[PDB]
Amino acid sequence: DPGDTLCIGYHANNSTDTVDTVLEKNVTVTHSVNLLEDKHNGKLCKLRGVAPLHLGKCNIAGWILGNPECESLSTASSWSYIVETPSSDNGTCYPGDFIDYEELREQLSSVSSFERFEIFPKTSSWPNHDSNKGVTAACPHAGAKSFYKNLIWLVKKGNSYPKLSKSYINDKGKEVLVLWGIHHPSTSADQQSLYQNADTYVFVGGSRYSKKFKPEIAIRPKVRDQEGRMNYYWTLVEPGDKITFEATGNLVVPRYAFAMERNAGSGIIISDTPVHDCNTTCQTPKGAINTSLPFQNIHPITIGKCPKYVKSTKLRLATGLRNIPSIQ
């Protein structure tokens, strides 16, 4: 034959990418993709474009009540998720039991509107009650005995504590978060020394909320030099609804309320990861993830539309041919 040649063959290159199959492993292929997202920017970013709320040295309990070390942050306009730190100690300086702490955090994780206003002004609401000496040594402010910024510790005005009765109606047209505290003194002498009365009561009542409180007086172990306890309570008020306060003592009256609109449930990230100016749609405590891959291995705890977390370290998906550049 007048020798002419035509062969059929396949591509090869210098790729060292290795994939695995059910029958074979360490198969070197020409081209491949990684189906597992395994890297993050290492920054806390803004879900849906909305920046998060970072509390720093304070936790949510300290931030919502106004601990003296708090409120130095950038107040609040709106946020997608709440960020604390592994050392966010400064919260309830006065020992006590914050009622439904975990449930409140879920509600506050994401908000559309959030404005703070003085629901009960200090100067023109408590004429017969002393809203000036209600401070404690357990809540210092640069060495000065202070108290929560959003709460007022009402005590007797010399020797007079009349039956307090103050009410408020939700004019804002939104949900209003109201927080108040109940003081439980150590000794019965401390009861009269602060409220001038022996057997007192506190009542808070709305159209749905109705509960009465009787102080429980006993000596507890010293916590930040405090043998008494102060349990903090909270509730939400529907628009155009009256909330009634009626106490003869041992009531930490609200001073600042919050008119807010709650979003769908979000998360709370606790990490030392810094916050920068990036958007992302997937956020993890390690960092933010910007990928279209269906799987990730950065952190099981994710907020937002995120890839499903897997324990895999390599999901190399073969797309090209078997790489055979040299036949031995």
Partner: protein, 175 residues
């Protein structure tokens, strides 16, 4: 593989061929040169691209806050939360690892099938006008110029045109 073309009767691949996955290597009086089949390679490109998007874009996730917070007297529901988290983790990890294992070789068998089909496409054209010297190659019994080579690559080889010339060389070789 599964069809015996890649790493089979074609022992290795061509480093020189860089314009596609599957192709030809001709050599005649004018010269030689690697040239990829632009139809099968493009068809394989569409399939594998659709393969990756099928796995990726079938995942449909919503906004979800995985983390949960529980107090000192909510250990039971806390453990239930981890059973949901760990259970979801175990399900996805098993599926993801085996999905890659299943599809990887299916892609490799897909490439093995495409190469063999290309060999059968050319073989069904040349018939006895060419001699199968093996290793994925054909030796022509007639003179195939550059225009003749393109007809095979175009899938329009004219067997009747060269049948008489191949007939004479085939039996002259026999004697």
């Amino acid at each position: 593989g599964l069809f015996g073309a890649i790493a089979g009767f074609i022992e290795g691949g061509w480093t020189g061929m860089v314009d596609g996955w599957y192709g030809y290597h001709h050599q005649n009086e004018q010269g030689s040169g690697y040239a990829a089949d632009l139809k099968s390679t493009q068809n394989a490109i569409d399939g594998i691209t659709n393969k990756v998007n099928s796995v990726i874009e079938k995942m449909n996730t919503q906004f979800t806050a995985v983390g949960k917070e529980f107090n000192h007297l909510e250990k039971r529901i806390e453990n239930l939360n981890k059973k949901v988290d760990d259970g979801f983790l175990d399900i996805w990890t098993y599926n993801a690892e085996l999905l890659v294992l299943l599809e990887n070789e299916r892609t490799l068998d897909y490439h093995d099938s495409n190469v063999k089909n290309l060999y059968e496409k050319v073989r069904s054209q040349l018939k006895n006008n060419a001699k199968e010297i093996g290793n994925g190659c054909f030796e022509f019994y007639h003179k195939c110029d550059n225009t003749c080579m393109e007809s095979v690559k175009n899938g329009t080889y004219d067997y009747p045109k060269y049948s008489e010339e191949a007939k004479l060389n085939r039996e002259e070789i026999d004697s």
